[PDB]
Write a protein that binds this ligand. Sequence first.
Ligand SMILES: CCCCCCCCC[C@@H](O)CSCCNC(=O)CCNC(=O)[C@H](O)C(C)(C)COP(=O)(O)OP(=O)(O)OC[C@H]1O[C@@H](n2cnc3c(N)ncnc32)[C@H](O)[C@@H]1OP(=O)(O)O
Ligand SMILES: CCCCCCCCC[C@@H](O)CSCCNC(=O)CCNC(=O)[C@H](O)C(C)(C)COP(=O)(O)OP(=O)(O)OC[C@H]1O[C@@H](n2cnc3c(N)ncnc32)[C@H](O)[C@@H]1OP(=O)(O)O
Lengths: 172, 195
Amino acid sequence: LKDCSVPNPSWNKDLRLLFDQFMKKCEDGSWKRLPSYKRSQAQLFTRSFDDGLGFEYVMFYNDIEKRMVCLFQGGPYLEGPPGFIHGGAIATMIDATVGMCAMMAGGIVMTANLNINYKRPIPLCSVVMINSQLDKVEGRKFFVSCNVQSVDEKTLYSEATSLFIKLNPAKS
Amino acid sequence: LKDCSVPNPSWNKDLRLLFDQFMKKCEDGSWKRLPSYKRTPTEWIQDFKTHFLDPKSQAQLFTRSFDDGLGFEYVMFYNDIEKRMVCLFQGGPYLEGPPGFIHGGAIATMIDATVGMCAMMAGGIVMTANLNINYKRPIPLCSVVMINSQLDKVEGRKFFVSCNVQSVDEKTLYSEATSLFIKLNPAKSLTLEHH
Ligand SMILES: CCCCCCCCC[C@@H](O)CSCCNC(=O)CCNC(=O)[C@H](O)C(C)(C)COP(=O)(O)OP(=O)(O)OC[C@H]1O[C@@H](n2cnc3c(N)ncnc32)[C@H](O)[C@@H]1OP(=O)(O)O
Ligand SMILES: CCCCCCCCC[C@@H](O)CSCCNC(=O)CCNC(=O)[C@H](O)C(C)(C)COP(=O)(O)OP(=O)(O)OC[C@H]1O[C@@H](n2cnc3c(N)ncnc32)[C@H](O)[C@@H]1OP(=O)(O)O
């Protein structure tokens, strides 16, 4: 049972720096780091590449603010347009972030809607901040939105909205 | 240039039988099989870098980064007169999200791949601007689905594509999506559109 949401030697300096800043944020308990594990042959999609090759990320959650931040570094195996991250790898990390935000707020959910605007392409081996927030809850409906930005927060790469439906275990 | 859109021992009978059916559809010439590779063909890399975007590898196509059967297994067939691209897709165990089912991002990925390849046939080098997915029913691991996309309208550099994700018998609708793709303006050119 290995935790992948901790620094390894594939991590760019920018990702290490940001991770350290968010670990400091965790000092008073207002933020908290989420461990992540690999998982027949079935494995978690975002944790199925070797180190550095696929998704490298850590999530930090702020309960008071119902906010999830994903620090994310995309490896060479996530390529779409030459030199950039595939639009589906972006959707994947968006979904994993906004979904985990809903799940920390309110428990088990599944994505019903995912609406992504790609504003600027993301360079392969770059590091981004996915910042999501729970906007409103309406019964079983969780409305989470987010944005993907450069580490320095100058560049806006993507914006997304999403709807998660809390499952009713007495039905599934 | 090894073609990954051909049958291999991981392809279950439904993927294999549905490949044969679309291969039959290709005989009259109305449909055509697309190849797919682990890496973009060097002609398109050259074109892309030299005229559009170069950010200054082990690089390989996201959808083709899994060994046989574990990830995305797929083939695309295109109909030019219908402006319609169909992807036959089988999702392996490494695509798991909810236990037993394909991750929403791996569904988004195969949707993006399909609608994106549809936009490219009509528009050349394009990139995703919007991708709007409704996930209606969960897709079980190792199931074979069809992604059916069509180009709905072209307006300047805008290509609007729709699609559906369906079971082989078409009775179960897993997902539906809409999308906007945008034909890239070369880096050294003006557009010269409104704005
Ligand atoms: C052969 C095998 C190879 C395999 C291939 C392998 C892999 C395949 C690769 C795959 O992985 C798929 S690429 C997947 C990842 N995609 C991206 O990263 C795209 C990032 N975005 C951009 O680079 C730019 O934003 C883009 C180039 C898209 C547009 O940038 P520009 O060109 O500068 O566009 P303008 O800003 O002048 O806007 C143009 C018009 O569009 C409108 N518009 C724009 N965005 C919109 C939105 N989100 N909703 C609604 N509308 C939107 C806008 O209002 C305007 O309309 P008007 O206002 O009516 O004029
Ligand atoms: C699982 C553990 C996580 C693992 C960790 C991995 C994590 C990675 C995460 C990824 O893996 C992602 S989870 C994997 C990807 N997700 C899926 O495949 C979900 C497929 N969908 C479904 O199973 C069902 O549609 C769902 C369970 C979503 C809802 O099924 P039901 O329970 O039958 O709910 P109802 O259908 O009665 O509708 C409920 C309400 O929502 C409204 N609505 C529904 N869809 C809508 C849409 N698209 N737009 C707008 N609205 C929509 C609807 O109008 C209704 O509203 P009201 O009638 O006004 O109340």
